[PDB]
UniProtKB/Swiss-Prot annotation, chain B:
Glycan-carrying positions: 40, 64
Taxonomic lineage: Viruses, Riboviria, Orthornavirae, Pisuviricota, Pisoniviricetes
Effect the entry attributes to changing residue 67 to Y: In strain: Theta/P.3
Result, substituting residue 58 to K: In strain: Theta/P.3
Top-level division of the source organism's lineage: Viruses
Disulphide bridges, residue numbers: 48-92
Purpose of the protein: Subunit of the fusion protein that is processed upon entry into the host cell. Mediates fusion of the virion and cellular membranes by functioning as a class I viral fusion protein. Contains a viral fusion peptide that is unmasked after S2 cleavage. This cleavage can occur at the cell membrane by host TMPRSS2 or during endocytosis by host CSTL. In either case, this triggers an extensive and irreversible conformational change that leads to fusion of the viral envelope with the cellular cytoplasmic membrane, releasing viral genomic RNA into the host cell cytoplasm.
Name of the protein in its database record: Spike protein S2'
From Swiss-Prot, chain C:
Disulfide bonds: 47-58
Protein name: Spike protein S2'
Positions bearing carbohydrate: 89
Role summary: Subunit of the fusion protein that is processed upon entry into the host cell. Mediates fusion of the virion and cellular membranes by functioning as a class I viral fusion protein. Contains a viral fusion peptide that is unmasked after S2 cleavage. This cleavage can occur at the cell membrane by host TMPRSS2 or during endocytosis by host CSTL. In either case, this triggers an extensive and irreversible conformational change that leads to fusion of the viral envelope with the cellular cytoplasmic membrane, releasing viral genomic RNA into the host cell cytoplasm.
Chain's gene name: S
Range within the parent protein: 986 to 1084 of 1273
Highest taxon above the source species: Viruses
C-alpha cells in the first residue's frame, strides 16, 4: 500500500571532539567514481514552408 | 593535471582521472585517495625541551600510551622526534598545552 | 456562435500568449538561479569543506575558513580571512655573497 | 482557469489548444523540479548529520552566533534567525482554504486572486527546519573535524590545531598562531559579533 | 541563387548554407468521382405543383 513518511536527511553521527585528541588514518583505499556530463544536443534545421 | 579543489574531481583527495566518451557527452573516471582505518592519539601543539619550544616541521606531535612521535598528517607513520623534524621558536611559557 | 466564437477565440489566443510569455520568463530566470545555485554549491565544497587558494573566491584576503548560514531561498556564507595589517619598509637583496 | 474562467463554451473551444497547455506545464514542472535539486546540491553534500558536541573549549573561539540556539522553537543560530526575519515572503504557509478566500472578500488578498485564476504556488521539498539541520551538521563537522569530514571519515582535531593548519595554508608558520592564540580568538569573536549587527 | 535571396545579398561568404529542400512538381492531375449517371431531381424540387 501507499505510505507517507517524513524523509530522513542522513545518518546520525558525531565527532569525538576533545582539546588534546586527534585521529590519524593508519590505512587507505583507492576509490574510483564515475561522473557523467552532457556535451552536446541534437543539431536541427527547419523548413517553415 | 591534479586539482586541489574539494569535490571538484570526485570525493576524496584527487589523484587522477581518465575520460571515456559516450553519445552526446563525456564520462570521467575519477581516481581518489580515501583515508580508511584510523586511530585515536593524544596530541600537543609543541614540545618543551630545554625551555625552548619545538614545533613540528611537517606533521603533528602524536602520542601513544607512553611515547611521543611526530607524524605526517594524512597517514600514521611515527618518527622519532629529533631536531630535524622540528623547528624552534619562542619558549615554554607561551604555547598553551605545550608538553 | 457565428460571431461569438470569433470574439472568444481572440481572447483565448491572447491569454495563451500571456501564459507563454510567463513561462518563457520563468525558464530564463530559472537558468540564472541554477547558475547561482551551482556557484553556491561550489563554494560550499571549496570554502566550507576545504581551504581555497583562489583569489577573492572565498572573500577578500587570504582564506582561512567559512561557515554557511541558511536564509529563505538561499545561503549566506561567512568567510573568515587573514589580512596583513601594520607593515614596515626594509632593504632587500636576492642573495647573500659569503665566501 | 486562467483562460476560460469556467465558461463552458470557452472550455470546449479551448480543446483545440490542449497540446499547448500541456507544453506550458511540462516547462513549469521542469523548473519546479530543478528548484529542489538546487537546494540539495547546495545543502545536502554531507549525509552524515554530525552533532555539535556539548560545548567544550575551542581555545577561546566563540561559535555561538553560528551554532543553533536551543532555546528557539526552530533551531536556528542567532544569525540565521536574523536572516529569516529580514527576507519577507509572499505568504506564511501553503494552505489557504476556499472558505478563507470566500469569507474575507474585503481583504482583496492577492494570493486568493492568484488562486482563483489558476495560478498555484507549490511548497519546497526541504523545509526550513531540514535546511537548518543540514547547516548545523556542516558546522559541527567544520568545527570538530575541519576539512576532513568532507573528504571521507571525520577525524577529530583540537580546534586550535585546525587553525594552525589554516595558517600554514595561507602561508605563515604555525608558531604565529599559538603565540598569538588569544589575540586571534578575540579578533575572530569580534568579527562575528559585528556581522550580526 | 536561393542562398543569395535568403540572405538578401548579391555576395555570399565562404561556408554552408541551407537551401530549402529537394522538391518535385506534379506533372498531371487526377480527378476521381463515383460514376453517377442520373441527374438530380431539380424538376421535382423546384417545379412542384
Ligand atoms: C609506543 O610505541 C613504542 C615504540 O614502538 C613502544 O615501545 C617499544 O616496545 C617494543 C616491544 O613491543 C620494545 O622492544 C622497544 O624497545 C620499545 N621502545 C622503547 C623506546 O621503549 C611502546 O610500548 C608503545 N606504547 C604503548 C602504550 O603502546
Ligand atoms: C559568546 O559570546 C556571548 C556574547 O555575545 C556570550 O553570551 C553572554 O553571556 C553573559 C554571561 O557570561 C550574559 O550576561 C550575556 O547576556 C550573554 N549575551 C548574550 C547576547 O546572550 C556567550 O556565553 C559566549 N560563549 C562562549 C562559548 O564563549
Ligand atoms: C597587533 O594588532 C592588535 C589589534 O588588532 C593589537 O592588540 C590590541 O592592543 C591594544 C594595546 O593598547 C589593546 O588595548 C587591545 O585590547 C588589543 N586588541 C585585542 C583584540 O586584543 C596588538 O597589540 C598588535 N601587536 C603588535 C605587535 O603591534
Ligand atoms: C575515539 O574515542 C571515542 C570515545 O567516545 C570512540 O567513540 C571512538 O570510536 C574512538 N575512535 C577511534 C578511531 O578509535
Ligand atoms: C616540565 O613541566 C613543568 C610544568 O608542568 C615546568 O615547570 C618544567 O620547567 C618542565 N621541565 C623541563 C622543560 O625540564
Ligand atoms: C584541555 O582541557 C583541560 C580541562 O578540562 C585542561 O586541564 C587541559 O590543560 C587542556 N589541554 C589543552 C591542550 O588545552
Ligand atoms: C616607505 O617609504 C615611502 C617613501 O616615499 C613612504 O611614503 C611609505 O609610507 C613608507 N612605508 C612604510 C610602511 O613605512
Ligand atoms: C665584497 O664585495 C665586493 C664587491 O663590492 C667583492 O669584490 C668582494 O669579493 C666581496 N668580499 C667577500 C665575499 O669577501
Ligand atoms: C418547369 O416547367 C416548364 C414548363 O411549364 C419547363 O419549360 C421547365 O423546363 C421546367 N423546369 C425544370 C427545372 O424542369
Amino acid at each position: 500500500s501507499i505510505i507517507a513518511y517524513t524523509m530522513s536527511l542522513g545518518a546520525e553521527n558525531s565527532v569525538a571532539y576533545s582539546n588534546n585528541s586527534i585521529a590519524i588514518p593508519t590505512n587507505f583505499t583507492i576509490s574510483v567514481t564515475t561522473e557523467i556530463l552532457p556535451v552536446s544536443m541534437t543539431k536541427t534545421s527547419v523548413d517553415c514552408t | 593535471g591534479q586539482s586541489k579543489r574539494v569535490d571538484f574531481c570526485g570525493k576524496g583527495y584527487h589523484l587522477m582521472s581518465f575520460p571515456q566518451s559516450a553519445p552526446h557527452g563525456v564520462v570521467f573516471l575519477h581516481v581518489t585517495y580515501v583515508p580508511a582505518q584510523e586511530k585515536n592519539f593524544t596530541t600537543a601543539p609543541a614540545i618543551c625541551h630545554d625551555g625552548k619550544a619545538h614545533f613540528p616541521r611537517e606533521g603533528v606531535f602524536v602520542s601513544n600510551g607512553t611515547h611521543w612521535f611526530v607524524t605526517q598528517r594524512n597517514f600514521y607513520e611515527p618518527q622519532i622526534i629529533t631536531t630535524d623534524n622540528t623547528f624552534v621558536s619562542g619558549n615554554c611559557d607561551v604555547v598553551i598545552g605545550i608538553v | 456562435p457565428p460571431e461569438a466564437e470569433v470574439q472568444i477565440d481572440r481572447l483565448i489566443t491572447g491569454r495563451l500568449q500571456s501564459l507563454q510569455t510567463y513561462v518563457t520568463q520563468q525558464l530564463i530566470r530559472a537558468a540564472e538561479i541554477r547558475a547561482s545555485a551551482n556557484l553556491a554549491a561550489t563554494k560550499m565544497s571549496e570554502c566550507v569543506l576545504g581551504q581555497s587558494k583562489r583569489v577573492d573566491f572565498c572573500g577578500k584576503g587570504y582564506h582561512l575558513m567559512s561557515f554557511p548560514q541558511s536564509a529563505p531561498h538561499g545561503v549566506v556564507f561567512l568567510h573568515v580571512t587573514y589580512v596583513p595589517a601594520q607593515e614596515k619598509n626594509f632593504t632587500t637583496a636576492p642573495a647573500i655573497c659569503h665566501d | 482557469m486562467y483562460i476560460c474562467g469556467d465558461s463552458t463554451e470557452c472550455s470546449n473551444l479551448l480543446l483545440q489548444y490542449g497540446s499547448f497547455c500541456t507544453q506550458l506545464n511540462r516547462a513549469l514542472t521542469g523548473i519546479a523540479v530543478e528548484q529542489d535539486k538546487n537546494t540539495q546540491e547546495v545543502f545536502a553534500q554531507v549525509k552524515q548529520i554530525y552533532k555539535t558536541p556539548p560545548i567544550k573549549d575551542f581555545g577561546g573561539f566563540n561559535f555561538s552566533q553560528i551554532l543553533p540556539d536551543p532555546s528557539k522553537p526552530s533551531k536556528r543560530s542567532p544569525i540565521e534567525d536574523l536572516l529569516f526575519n529580514k527576507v519577507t515572503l509572499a505568504d506564511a504557509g501553503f494552505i489557504k482554504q476556499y472558505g478563507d478566500c470566500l469569507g474575507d472578500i474585503a481583504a482583496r488578498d492577492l494570493i486568493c486572486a492568484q488562486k482563483f485564476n489558476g495560478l498555484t504556488v507549490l511548497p519546497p521539498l526541504l523545509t526550513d527546519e531540514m535546511i537548518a539541520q543540514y547547516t548545523s551538521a556542516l558546522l559541527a563537522g567544520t568545527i570538530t573535524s575541519g576539512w576532513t569530514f568532507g573528504a571521507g571519515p571525520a577525524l577529530q582535531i583540537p580546534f586550535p590545531m585546525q587553525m594552525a593548519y589554516r595558517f600554514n595554508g595561507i602561508g605563515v608558520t604555525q608558531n604565529v598562531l599559538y603565540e598569538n592564540q588569544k589575540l586571534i580568538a578575540n579578533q575572530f569573536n569580534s568579527a562575528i559579533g559585528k556581522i550580526q549587527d | 541563387s536561393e542562398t543569395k535571396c535568403t540572405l538578401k545579398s548579391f555576395t555570399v561568404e565562404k561556408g554552408i548554407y541551407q537551401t530549402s529542400n529537394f522538391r518535385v512538381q506534379p506533372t498531371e492531375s487526377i480527378v476521381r468521382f463515383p460514376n453517377i449517371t442520373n441527374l438530380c431531381p431539380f424538376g421535382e424540387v423546384f417545379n412542384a405543383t
